Design a protein around this ligand. Structure first.
Ligand SMILES: O=C1Cc2cc(Nc3nc(Cl)ncc3F)ccc2N1
Ligand SMILES: O=C1Cc2cc(Nc3nc(Cl)ncc3F)ccc2N1
Ligand SMILES: [Cl-]
Ligand SMILES: [Cl-]
Lengths: 4, 124, 124, 4
């Protein structure tokens, strides 16, 4: 999971 | 927005769509390319091809379970492009590049047409 | 094999599937979550959820155009998860995390359940 | 395009  | 994003989600979805295709699950159209038949999902075809997008957004054609392609289309070229649609991988070889490029132009797959043109330019 | 791969293909496919959903093109099921209705593509739901995979591979249920979810399921939690299926982005907030996690457990979306558990653990 |  990432900060888009 | 303040969303988080799962990097591998799109690739995992496509892998599962290809697993459904393999297992003939919920395939809803047969594409006929002369003597060969290819089963697929209308939504995946529309998402990848400008030609299928135009076909399945047409009020009459959206209801067809069989679509016949132009007789000049090569079944192997179509098969390579259908595999690309479901996997992101293109099996481009010296022996198939002309058929693949011609099929991608007909199907309106601009990114494939672009890589074929570049590989052809490199050979000249 | 000796394939080349187009990096952005899977993301571009998913973006186009979401555009079809937006425009209600070739949606083939309605998911009912108490008083709310959500239209979607059966193939996308199966590709993202272990519950929908089991439902639409069942010989009787694969033919249904309406699926009613358990009344304990929160429509907002479902809406957030449906958006995640079509975009890879999860709108996780302090005010919805419990409903989202409960819905993801019911839908069998293991990666979402994993991120919810981690965000909850960080708050404790 | 890349070599996967
Ligand atoms: O080279 C290409 C690939 C391609 C795919 C599509 N697909 C869709 N386009 C839109 Cl805007 N919404 C939903 C779709 F399924 C249209 C045109 C083109 N041309
Ligand atoms: O957390 C999850 C997400 C998820 C999706 C699927 N989907 C499919 N699985 C297979 Cl192997 N082939 C085709 C599919 F559409 C099954 C189980 C699970 N569990
Ligand atoms: Cl393309
Ligand atoms: Cl997930």
């Amino acid at each position: 999971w990432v900060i888009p | 927005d303040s969303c988080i994003q799962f990097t591998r989600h799109a690739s995992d979805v496509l892998l599962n769509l290809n697993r459904l295709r393999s297992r003939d699950i919920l395939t809803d159209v047969v594409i006929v390319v002369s003597r060969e038949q290819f089963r697929a999902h209308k939504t995946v075809l529309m998402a990848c091809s400008g030609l299928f997008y135009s076909i399945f957004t047409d009020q009459l054609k959206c209801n067809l379970s069989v679509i016949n392609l132009d007789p000049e289309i090569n079944p192997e070229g179509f098969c390579i492009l259908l595999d690309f649609m479901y996997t992101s991988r293109l099996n481009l070889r010296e022996g198939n590049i002309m058929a693949v490029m011609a099929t991608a132009m007909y199907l309106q797959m601009e990114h494939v047409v672009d890589t074929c043109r570049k590989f052809i330019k490199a050979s000249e």
